[PDB]
Amino acid sequence: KKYSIGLDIGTNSVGWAVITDEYKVPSKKFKVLGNTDRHSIKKNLIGALLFDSGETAERTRLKRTARRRYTRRKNRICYLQEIFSNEMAKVDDSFFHRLEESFLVEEDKKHERHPIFGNIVDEVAYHEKYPTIYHLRKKLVDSTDKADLRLIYLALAHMIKFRGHFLIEGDLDVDKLFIQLVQTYNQLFEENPINASGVDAKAILSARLSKSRRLENLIAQLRVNTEITKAPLSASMIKRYDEHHQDLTLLKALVRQQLPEKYKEIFFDQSKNGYAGYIDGGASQEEFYKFIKPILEKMDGTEELLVKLNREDLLRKQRTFDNGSIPHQIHLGELHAILRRQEDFYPFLKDNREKIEKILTFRIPYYVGPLARGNSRFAWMTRKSEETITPWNFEEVVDKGASAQSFIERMTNFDKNLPNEKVLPKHSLLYEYFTVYNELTKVKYVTFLSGEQKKAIVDLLFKTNRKVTVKQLKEDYFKKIECFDSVEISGVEDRFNASLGTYHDLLKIIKDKDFLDNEENEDILEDIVLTLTLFEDREMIEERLKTYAHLFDDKVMKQLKRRRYTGWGRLSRKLINGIRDKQSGKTILDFLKSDGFANRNFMQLIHDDSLTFKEDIQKAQVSDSLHEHIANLAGSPAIKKGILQTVKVVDELVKVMGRHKPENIVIELVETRQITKHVAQILDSRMVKVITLKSKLVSDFRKDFQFYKVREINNYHHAHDAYLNAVVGTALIKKIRDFATVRKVLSMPQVNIVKKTEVQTGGFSKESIRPKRNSDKLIARKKDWDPKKYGGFLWPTVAYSVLVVAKVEKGKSKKLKSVKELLGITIMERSSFEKNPIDFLEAKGYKEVKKDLIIKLPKYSLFELENGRKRMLASAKQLQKGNELALPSKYVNFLYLASHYEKLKGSPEDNEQKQLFVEQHKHYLDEIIEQISEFSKRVILADANLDKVLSAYNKHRDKPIREQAENIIHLFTLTRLGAPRAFKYFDTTIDPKQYRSTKEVLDATLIHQSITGLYETRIDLSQLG
């Protein structure tokens, strides 16, 4: 009955063990089910759970937000189409139709293949007159002539689809701003004085030069636009286009006159990274520059061309990766220019100009979130009226106060020590007091700081200065006030890490200094800085300071509206100047102010059980079905997977041994402290001494005895550490034949190593849309879009394999022949297959499948074959090795100690004596060799690679023993659990092979293994079908 469990935690492995007090590992016979003749198998109660590490949610978040912004961009286009439809349907009703059908091929289009004019000659004339859309944009901004409505709609569509950035909140010289900027740094701190006040940023930086030249000339002293007239971006990039055209013409002239042989390569071959590769191919700007630059370097006449290339201004495109710095205000200024130019010709545009200006200028606020109407789990909002939200009426519908209230009760964290309380900001004034006082506490005094002394030095120094150093204490306070000669201080190396920056920020802004120094107004200021941390946009920031009009109303209250904070703390109000000690009557801040000039630290206050903070803490973190009992827990989704596997493994381990519970369980920094308390809550929630273990102890004891570890050998070590954890835990809890038993049970060759079988959730496929081809493996990215003509994705991610037995007709003389095979289900046919399996299987060509014999086969499904061969299943088209080798303990001690000479030199009298013992007994390495050869001939069945490795063995077995042992450790890739990989011996890189053949498992024995692997069901697929 009596037993204990050892258990290690990891990102990919959960090791489990069952152990007795005499350290005897019990061995028991277990029922197996299925159509096999086997009915009882003998296994040891030692095993390890191996699984793929889970994903944290950020990638899904980026994909979700990207989906939303694509949808919103399409909705902006839809709004503008809805506006222009009524009037341009008079001149061209099918214009939007030709725009949306522009992707289709000429037969698939329901209209003419030219989208803009519906005819060849007008489209050619438009392209000749306007080579780009920037030509059209500049013409519409500058010219006052009446324009065709299609061109204007093209301007607005291009202009709102790509609309720049919202990092500028105003309306919108640079040298004067730089002068004020360096002046405000000079006021900000007494560091890095300027060389001279006559700096002129426009002369040095906006003048056309490279970044290195501008940097060097700026150090020596210490966005390009053309004309004042409107449309500056269109003018600058039309200059860029004209310069590109002139440089193209001069390039053609120079390479035709000078190098006729490389003209073909550069201007026709799209694969050799030439100009044809820069336009037609996938070449970037930088790689095109670096390939073309030697051509102009070795041959003459290209000095201006080199200085253009060094500024990266040579042959630029318009659509360029550096366009991410253009704000949206230049865009809305350009659009306001066009709709002022075309308002009299089209009074329709005069009727709703502000609507289009709103579609450009509107953005969902930071705090509002998705416009869900309760259809989403992410949204916050409540709407005042049940209307369809448009940019034209967003604030009329949305209750911003309630939306921001729903915003604030969610984003801020809860204190890790006080889970019921929301956290203060990092830049909160009280947080600055607490971090400064935690730094002041460690400040010693010999001639620590006393509370009256701390109050005085704060009122003198911290009331007036932005930064504090220990020398400034001993010269400004202790020499001045108390007239001391010197004070021995070693609290902090020179100046203090912490400071009251936000306190000085209010001292900078508002006029009433006594209002800031008064302790009554602390809550108002905390609400203010909380507000500035919460919101970064103007509106609700202005709303929340409008509550404080009755305190002050001057323009210095107005000036808070522009400045902002970001970030959040780890510490809350009700902890620190909250809970009060019963005896002392002092909170955390009260003790950081004073303890008899012998002040005590925060973590000292928490850890000391004599004071009542330690009693008051765990009763605060005292935080049903098991899945929802864990679904509310904290921690990353990647590291929670081990927690579910742990709780399942422990429950079924109890379930195996006659429903009987252990005496002690042992678990393998702060996260495991939360784990040991959460697993201790099971004692009163679902129904056992949960004992913590340090890994350095087991590593040291492994160094004390013979049984060392090598990771690359085998995966039995992922259960040996669990048994070791059990060993040390039960051994410990009985403490400025068993010691004889451990040796035998260490060498046990059967340990239940189980790979978890999950359906693979994730994306469609690898995401690069491959070009058109005649292959049938191209995946249709859209339902109508045939991948023969429109391309699509490749490499889909399989969800699970599906074994089917059915009848399939093959051959020209079509014969209904019986077939047994497994089929791969990818992620987006999983829904249709789980909806109706037989109809979907019939759709792919299988006839009269067996309904009750369809077997769902996930990834890492395990098969048993003849002669004990085990193979793991990766997909419908690739297998995976699943057999492990165990060396005797003498062999792994030889292999570990032969490598790592300098680690065995730490104790020369014993380990380096044992180092001599692994220069001799070189036969053990030959023993390792024939173990690998025997195991490969048994289950790997590889021939040519083994002759290669034995030839390389016999030719390089002369070399020193350390590198021999480390390459023998490197040799285990051939025998490793998992996939074949390329790996390095002394002189050759051995290529892996692919087990493409799935036919050898269709008559094997499928081995379902449990969560702990002690219970099995063995379906022999040869009997089926």
Partner DNA sequence: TTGTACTGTAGCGTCT
Partner DNA sequence: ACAGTACAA
Partner RNA sequence: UAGAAAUACGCGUUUUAGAGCUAGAAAUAGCAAGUUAAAAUAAGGCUAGUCCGUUAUCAACUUGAAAAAGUGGCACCGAGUCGGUGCUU
Residues annotated within the binding site for Mn(2+) are 8, 668, 718, 956, 987
CB of 225 to RNA, least distance (A): 17
Max Cα distance, the chain (Å): 112
Residue 991 touching DNA (CB under 7 A): yes
Let me know if 8 is a catalytic residue: yes
The single residue among 183, 413, 447, 604 that binds RNA, judged by CB under 7 A, is: 413
Closer residue to DNA, CB minimum distance, 689 or 817: 817
Q: Which residue is listed with tokens 């499948």?
A: 849
Among positions 14-33, residues that touch RNA (CB under 7 A) are 25-33
The number of beta carbons lying within 10 Å of the beta carbon of residue 56 is 13
Contact 741, 24 (CB under 8 A): yes
CA distance 543 to 150: 43
Nearest-CA neighbor of 395 among 354, 357, 363? 363
Choose the one of DNA, RNA, none that binds residue 997, judging by a C-beta under 5 to 8 angstroms depending on kind. Answer: DNA
Residue 794 touching DNA (CB under 7 A): yes
CB of 730 to RNA, least distance (A): 18
CB of 355 to RNA, least distance (A): 12
Nearest-10 Cα torsion for 908, 914, 915, 919:
150
Contact code string over 889-928 relative to RNA, x by CB under 7 A: ----------------------------------------
The single residue among 31, 810, 847, 890 that binds DNA, judged by CB under 7 A, is: 810
From 8, 415, 505, 721, active-site residue: 8
Choose the one of RNA, DNA, none that binds residue 249, judging by a C-beta under 5 to 8 angstroms depending on kind. Answer: RNA
Among positions 185-214, residues that touch DNA (CB under 7 A) are none
Contact 1004, 1021 (CB under 8 A): yes
The DSSP-derived string for 475-528 is HHTTTTTS--S-----SSSSB-S---HHHHHHHHH-S-HHHHH-GGGHHHHHHH
Nearest-CA neighbor of 238 among 158, 138, 129, 330? 138
Instruction: Give the HSE-up count for residue 539: Cα atoms under 13 Å, Cβ half-sphere.
Output: 12
Contact 879, 997 (CB under 8 A): yes
Residue 394 touching RNA (CB under 7 A): yes
Phi, psi (degrees; rounded to nearest 5) at 752: -75, 85
The single residue among 321, 583, 812, 851 that binds RNA, judged by CB under 7 A, is: 321
Residue 103 touching RNA (CB under 7 A): yes
Residue 824 touching DNA (CB under 7 A): yes
Q: Which residue is listed with tokens 């509107």?
A: 362
The single residue among 47, 391, 662, 980 that binds RNA, judged by CB under 7 A, is: 391
Contact 302, 106 (CB under 8 A): no
Residue 875 touching DNA (CB under 7 A): yes
Residue 226 touching DNA (CB under 7 A): no
What is the size of the binding site for RNA (CB under 7 A)?
184
CA distance 957 to 950: 10
Choose the one of DNA, RNA, none that binds residue 591, judging by a C-beta under 5 to 8 angstroms depending on kind. Answer: none
Q: Which stretch binds DNA (CB under 7 A): 439-447, 586-594, 789-797, 902-910?
A: 789-797
Choose the one of RNA, DNA, none that binds residue 213, judging by a C-beta under 5 to 8 angstroms depending on kind. Answer: none
CA distance 953 to 943: 15
Phi, psi (degrees; rounded to nearest 5) at 159: -85, -35
Residue 771 touching DNA (CB under 7 A): no
Contact 367, 538 (CB under 8 A): no
**Strand pairing partners for 327?**
165
Distances in Å between the Cα of 128 and the Cα atoms of 131, 338, 673 are 6, 22, 72
Closer residue to RNA, CB minimum distance, 473 or 1011: 1011
Residue 766 touching DNA (CB under 7 A): yes
Choose the one of RNA, DNA, none that binds residue 782, judging by a C-beta under 5 to 8 angstroms depending on kind. Answer: RNA
* Helix, strand or coil, per DSSP, at residue 327: strand
Question: Binding site: residue ranges?
Answer: 8, 668, 718, 956, 987
Residue 819 touching RNA (CB under 7 A): no
Contact code string over 290-329 relative to DNA, x by CB under 7 A: ----------------------------------x-----
CA distance 1018 to 1007: 5
Choose the one of DNA, RNA, none that binds residue 993, judging by a C-beta under 5 to 8 angstroms depending on kind. Answer: DNA
CB of 985 to RNA, least distance (A): 22
Residue 143 touching DNA (CB under 7 A): no
Residue 960 touching RNA (CB under 7 A): no
* Helix, strand or coil, per DSSP, at residue 872: strand
The tokens for 778 are 């191209």
Residue 233 touching DNA (CB under 7 A): no
Among positions 665-724, residues that touch RNA (CB under 7 A) are none
CA distance 465 to 723: 59
Phi, psi (degrees; rounded to nearest 5) at 978: 120, -135
The single residue among 346, 552, 707, 1015 that binds RNA, judged by CB under 7 A, is: 1015
Q: What is the CA radius of gyration of the chain?
A: 37
The tokens for 368 are 């509002």
Between strands 870-873 and 861-864, the pairing is antiparallel
Residue 641 touching RNA (CB under 7 A): yes
Residue 743 touching RNA (CB under 7 A): no
The single residue among 184, 388, 768, 867 that binds DNA, judged by CB under 7 A, is: 768
Residue 154 touching RNA (CB under 7 A): yes
Residue 64 touching DNA (CB under 7 A): no
The tokens for 434 are 């607490």
Residue 874 touching DNA (CB under 7 A): yes
Closer residue to DNA, CB minimum distance, 85 or 775: 775
CB of 866 to DNA, least distance (A): 17
Contact 820, 805 (CB under 8 A): yes
Among positions 564-583, residues that touch DNA (CB under 7 A) are 566
Contacts of 105 (CB under 8 A, 6+ apart): 789, 790
Q: Which stretch binds RNA (CB under 7 A): 159-167, 228-236, 302-310, 346-354?
A: 159-167
Residue 434 touching RNA (CB under 7 A): no
Residue 876 touching DNA (CB under 7 A): yes
Buried b (16+ CB within 10 A) or exposed e, 778-799: bbeeeeeeebeebbbbbebebb
Q: Which stretch binds DNA (CB under 7 A): 89-97, 288-296, 686-694, 773-781?
A: 773-781
Nearest-CA neighbor of 890 among 863, 855, 927? 927
Residue 993 touching DNA (CB under 7 A): yes
What does the DSSP 8-state code read for residue 425? P
CA distance 136 to 991: 58
Nearest-CA neighbor of 723 among 30, 24, 51? 24
CB of 486 to RNA, least distance (A): 36
Nearest-CA neighbor of 882 among 636, 663, 714? 714
Residue 989 touching DNA (CB under 7 A): no
What does the DSSP 8-state code read for residue 851? G
CB of 525 to DNA, least distance (A): 22
The residue count of the chain comes to 1025
Q: Which stretch binds RNA (CB under 7 A): 200-208, 436-444, 549-557, 742-750?
A: 742-750
Distances in Å between the Cα of 430 and the Cα atoms of 255, 411, 529, 595 are 70, 20, 10, 20
What does the DSSP 8-state code read for residue 831? H
Among positions 259-318, residues that touch RNA (CB under 7 A) are 260, 263-264, 267-268, 275-276, 279-280, 282, 317-318
CB of 541 to RNA, least distance (A): 15
CB of 775 to DNA, least distance (A): 4
Residue 686 touching DNA (CB under 7 A): no
Residues that bind DNA (CB under 7 A): 324, 536, 566, 766-768, 773, 775, 777-778, 794-796, 798, 810, 824, 874-878, 880, 979, 991, 993-994, 996-997, 999
Active site residues: 8
